[PDB]
Design a binder for this molecule. Sequence first.
Ligand code: HEM
Ligand code: HEM
Ligand SMILES: N=C(Nc1cccc(CNCCc2ccc(-c3ccccc3)cc2CN)c1)c1cncs1
Ligand SMILES: N=C(Nc1cccc(CNCCc2ccc(-c3ccccc3)cc2CN)c1)c1cncs1
Ligand SMILES: C[C@H](O)[C@H](O)[C@H]1CNc2nc(N)[nH]c(=O)c2N1
Ligand SMILES: C[C@H](O)[C@H](O)[C@H]1CNc2nc(N)[nH]c(=O)c2N1
Ligand SMILES: [Zn+2]
Lengths: 410, 410
Amino acid sequence: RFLKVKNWETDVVLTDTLHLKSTLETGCTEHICMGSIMLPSVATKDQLFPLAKEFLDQYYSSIKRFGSKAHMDRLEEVNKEIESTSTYQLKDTELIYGAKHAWRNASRCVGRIQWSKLQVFDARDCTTAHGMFNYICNHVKYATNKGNLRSAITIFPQRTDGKHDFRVWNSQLIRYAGYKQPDGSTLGDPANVQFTEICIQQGWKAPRGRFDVLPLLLQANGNDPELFQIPPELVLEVPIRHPKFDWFKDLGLKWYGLPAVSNMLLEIGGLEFSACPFSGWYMGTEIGVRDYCDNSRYNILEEVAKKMDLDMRKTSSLWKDQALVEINIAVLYSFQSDKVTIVDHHSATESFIKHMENEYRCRGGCPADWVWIVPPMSGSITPVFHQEMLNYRLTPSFEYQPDPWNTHVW
Amino acid sequence: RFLKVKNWETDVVLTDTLHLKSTLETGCTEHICMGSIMLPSVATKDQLFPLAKEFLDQYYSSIKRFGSKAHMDRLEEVNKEIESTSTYQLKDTELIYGAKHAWRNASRCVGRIQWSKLQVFDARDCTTAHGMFNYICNHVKYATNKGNLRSAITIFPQRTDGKHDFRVWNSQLIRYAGYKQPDGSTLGDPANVQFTEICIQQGWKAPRGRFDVLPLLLQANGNDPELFQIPPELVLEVPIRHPKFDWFKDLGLKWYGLPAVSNMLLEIGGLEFSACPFSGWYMGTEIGVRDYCDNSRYNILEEVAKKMDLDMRKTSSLWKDQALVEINIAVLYSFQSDKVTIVDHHSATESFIKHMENEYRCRGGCPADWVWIVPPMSGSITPVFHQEMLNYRLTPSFEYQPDPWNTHVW
Ligand code: HEM
Ligand code: HEM
Ligand SMILES: N=C(Nc1cccc(CNCCc2ccc(-c3ccccc3)cc2CN)c1)c1cncs1
Ligand SMILES: N=C(Nc1cccc(CNCCc2ccc(-c3ccccc3)cc2CN)c1)c1cncs1
Ligand SMILES: C[C@H](O)[C@H](O)[C@H]1CNc2nc(N)[nH]c(=O)c2N1
Ligand SMILES: C[C@H](O)[C@H](O)[C@H]1CNc2nc(N)[nH]c(=O)c2N1
Ligand SMILES: [Zn+2]
């Protein structure tokens, strides 16, 4: 009931008691571990108050006023609001706490050493897609900060009945389009082929190229979603060059500076925020390994190995690995030479171990998803490979949610 | 009760029903996933017969004579032997089945496409450490096969009372020694510093160098273990050169051809074989990434990056990654140019996916430990990174066991 996690590169042992506070379930059982399943699986007033109480008890505990008078009155006040409306409203402070701790609690996120320095934009007064556009533009501008990127989240009104959701239909605020071709190939980002055509369905005039920034498809208060184009000046992009290979620029690769996930759901005290785009900055491998080198993505190991004049005749020449390192040196170099925030997988994984020690010390644990924390290349030469991690579900939290076009009564 | 695993690089879906046959437990619960914990945790006649029956039922099922007369007689015969002796003896055929399926069931093993082509050496008539030496030498000679390596297992007598165990005290039949220095550094393999000194305690005269093959410490029928030196001619080694960098030979690196784990316990029908050294061949990354480049192992990223004249001033130059690829190209090249069996992580992981499809098809599942199946470099450019895997414990199985010097009443 007081579990131990060991680091086998350092022989460091941390004791986890925070998992005792875990509420949700993991997918694993006593007889089957589901740690590698990608996705693991209306709210009534009866279920709502325990969740509110739990949250308010940790909120008031954190500001060193647990059991104080303001706590009991707020507990009473939220119960009375749940009785009347079968829901309730968070104070601005409780909203900022919840979002920060949802990030703190995101076990798949290696970037959490920064969780307390999160900028919370309260967009709960928003009523229209245009207002969402406005809020999102201000989010992008603020988080981008001329390349000195800043963590931020914009929180649209919470789900109520269920038929009146706010959704950003983009999976990220800034993504490149993906078009299939006559010959069945894929121009741009294959990940977004369906979403690109959804925008073309709703009326997007596509500039059928590679790195075309998709429009925003914004649904407000359950209404049908509406297209908006982010001002190009707000979309900071990095052309990818290599510090040695001058042909690398001829690849014409570029990526956007700001990673901003917009398809997740934020849970705070049983309240559900279906539109809560959050942004930080990139770990280099996200672009250089996954985005560029996944087979089902841009898939450029082919061309880079060619230009490096690599032995591509069999697997065992490791030409794939060799080109993968050059690509990631190029992403990091390009971002840093442009003063656009980025972190290499070595710095970020070391920071995550330091983060883990802090959390185990000043919190009794740190839920962590090894499958997702270990970077997609160079696993074992980073310290997280050798770090045992306990995964468990704490709340406030970020949850997955269906794509809105699969669920929306149209 | 009929779980689905998806490959997200291929959109392939496999349905797992074999997990229903799972007996042991995983360490995970509904509320906590332990998929990244390295190690997860006398036998009476009462518990013994269900385990025998279970095993014999799958054995006779596999030879298409389940419920036949020979099955019932063997079930009766083993029950009568458990009644009399509170244990029993496997037929040679049942021993070969059990070992093969223990390997088939090893969820952390990416090499299992070969599980049915395993050479089983029955050493259950062995009574002394010298007989163990003999058997082990013949194992090494056979499995090595002049570089055309062959899978094999040597199975010493099963545990009886518990105080009469056969143990190989080496973690692998062939490992390099590790010596600490006056300046507290480490010559050779730091992994084996304690075991190297244990041999020096029992009387090994150490040639305090780098790649000194350790002696065998063999315990037979519970007696104190005894030192034996494998004939050098039986120990096949590969000098590590690079196909491009001629200074690479000046590193003077070499590794042994034959990976043969000797510290695990083989469970077959409730019977426990505490000495069961098994060998196959190397996946390249085991040597080139873990053995050479773990901080707590040979730790040669330092020197290789130096000779490559790499920018070693900060992490973000990826000099560590770059040197890691060159080292693994060198291991694969050196082994292949010497006709010593080796498999690169690309070929082995592709084979494991093919293996998985076979098992799900002709067996309903394949327990798999993603944390261990994904190679320690280039994770996501291999197909197992994108493959969801269910981990669960099937028997016959290979289990960990305490190091014998921690348990042996001396
Ligand atoms: C500040 C720099 C940040 C870095 C370097 C970072 C890095 C990462 C990485 C590499 C992942 C793995 C997911 C993937 O590979 O697609 C991840 C996951 C995640 N991050 Fe962070 N992140 C940062 C900021 C944030 C912020 C500000 C939030 C929330 C406010 C957040 C919440 C999450 C969540 C919920 C996941 C899980 C995603 C999923 O399950 O698909 N991260 N992060
Ligand atoms: C034939 C070629 C083989 C290859 C390429 C191979 C490869 C691997 C690799 C890379 C691992 C990961 C463990 C580590 O990184 O230390 C592993 C684990 C394992 N293998 Fe295989 N193996 C082979 C043969 C065998 C055989 C013949 C057996 C048993 C008879 C076996 C049983 C196991 C077991 C029990 C584990 C889990 C080890 C642990 O939990 O520490 N393997 N294998
Ligand atoms: N630095 C960052 N990174 C990052 C952080 C959180 C989440 C993500 C993206 N996580 C996507 C995981 C995923 C989910 C679904 C599918 C998928 C694909 C096809 C069909 C169905 C589902 C695929 C993937 C990744 N293959 C990136 C940041 C982005 N914002 C703030 S920080
Ligand atoms: N190709 C092969 N590979 C392979 C297969 C099975 C097992 C292994 C070795 N698995 C070792 C995992 C391990 C266990 C304990 C400790 C440890 C270290 C210090 C203290 C306590 C425990 C460390 C490690 C690895 N870091 C390699 C083969 C070897 N034979 C036949 S195939
Ligand atoms: C099958 C597997 O769960 C899937 O590919 C996961 C593995 N680990 C990951 N880790 C990160 N950071 N991002 C991912 O998309 C994935 N994908
Ligand atoms: C903490 C973690 O479980 C540990 O380092 C594991 C991770 N995955 C591994 N995978 C393999 N193949 N071999 C290992 O030694 C390990 N070590
Ligand atoms: Zn699990």
